Amino acid sequence: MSWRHIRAEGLDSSYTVLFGKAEADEIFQELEKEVEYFTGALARVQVAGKWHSVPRKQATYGDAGLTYTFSGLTLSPKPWIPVLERIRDHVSGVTGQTFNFVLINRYKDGSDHICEHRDDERELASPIASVSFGASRDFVFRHKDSVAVVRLPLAHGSLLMMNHPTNTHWYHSLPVRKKVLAPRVNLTFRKILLM
DNA sequence: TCGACAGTGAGACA
DNA sequence: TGTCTCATGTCG
Ligand SMILES: [Mg+2]
């Protein structure tokens, strides 16, 4: 495939268009039809005097028997459904990697956003693979000591690999974009350690 | 608790 | 003067 390499001090990501327009549209429609997001009616849960939040407005799928941590709670993801395995397999076919877990987030319009953050490394092996469908949304990298800014529209059917050491030295965000009126779905594939 | 996003002020430009 | 973008406070 044709890769754009995103290079800077401590930043190594790469970007390509994984699915052409027609196939991206079909997968997008199937994602909207099939993915089941936690609603967040239930907001938190307490054990031994400590509250723990519960994931809202996202969906997790992964291999049978796998568990992952979220705010101190160990959870099991939903078993793979066919469209996710399809996407997972295209990502693998184009990188030589395997993934056992995916986090799906939905951004209904430009006002849904994500504030500057670094992914939890505690449970990861590995490159993080992020696949987008729907409206194009700007994704931005900033350095944890600032140093330059890198901005990338994540287009319909694209794959962004965040390779080591991107996630240690740079924080990422998906900022508000008022003029975007249409939804975006993002899939973040990982390999969860069995250790 | 502490993660998601509400709230806010400064600065741009329309 | 109004709306947007960028970069601490709250609460379930
Ligand atoms: Mg992230």
In angstroms, this model's resolution equals 2.3
Contact predicate A133/A184, CB 8 Å: yes
Distance of CA A163 to the CA centre of its chain: 14
CB half-sphere exposure, A84, CA atoms < 13 A: 27
Q: Which residue is the nearest neighbor of C6, CA to C1'?
A: A175
Nearby residues for ligand 1 (ion, Cβ within 5 Å): A 119
**Structure determination method:** X-ray
- Amino acid, single-letter form, for residue A29: Q
Distance A165 CA to ligand 1 centre (A): 14
Residue A135 and residue A149: Cα distance in Å, rounded?
A: 22
What whole-number distance in Å separates Cα of residue A147 and Cα of residue A137? 23
DSSP A144-163: TT---EEEEEE-TTEEEEE-
Q: Which 3 state secondary structure label does DSSP give A83?
A: helix
Complete domains list, chain A, with CATH: 1-195 (2.60.120.590)
The contacts of residue A26 (CB under 8 Å, 6+ apart) are: none
Tokens 């987008």, residue? A132
Give residue A83 CA to ligand 1 midpoint distance, Å. Answer: 22
Query: How distant is C1' of B5 from CA of A113, in Å?
Result: 9
In the structure encoding, which two tokens stand for residue A91, read together?
């990502």
Buried b (16+ CB within 10 A) or exposed e, A70-109: beeeeeebeebeebbeebbebbeeebeeebbbbbbbbbeb
